[PDB]
Design a protein around this ligand. Structure first.
Ligand code: QPR
Length: 117
């Protein structure tokens, strides 16, 4: 029989992994709010990043039952990373900070995924 997830239980299981990302200081700072290309003066951003994602949007989704399965949450976290790694220079602050968050995410998401299945 296939496992089905209750919204508050999926939120409780995944939230610690999101909190771990959000608490990285300074590395979460470029990711705590959506990229605003108008405010940052980068009109080319949405020509490269078709599906923006950031930590505040991931949290708002985890809080409002928008993830039905844990892998939809994992997909959004990787989308945030892959956007940053495509747009930014490899030794830029944003790219280096992204790679730190991805290290933290990998080290934390594995037991949670095993425990959820
Ligand atoms: C997440 C991301 O790509 C970026 C976040 N900030 C604050 C930026 C500033 C310039 C270029 C890219 C970004």
């Amino acid at each position: 029989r296939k496992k089905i997830f209750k919204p508050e239980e999926l939120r409780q299981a995944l939230m610690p992994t999101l909190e771990a990302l959000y608490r990285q200081d300074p590395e979460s700072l470029p990711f705590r709010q959506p990229v605003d290309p108008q405010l940052l003066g980068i009109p080319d951003y949405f020509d490269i990043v078709k599906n923006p994602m950031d930590l505040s949007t991931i949290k708002r989704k985890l809080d409002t039952g928008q993830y039905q399965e844990p892998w939809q949450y994992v997909d959004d976290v990787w989308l945030m990373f892959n956007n940053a790694w495509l747009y930014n220079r490899k030794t830029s602050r944003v790219y280096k900070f992204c790679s730190k968050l991805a290290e933290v995410f990998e080290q934390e998401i594995d037991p949670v995924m095993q425990s959820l299945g």
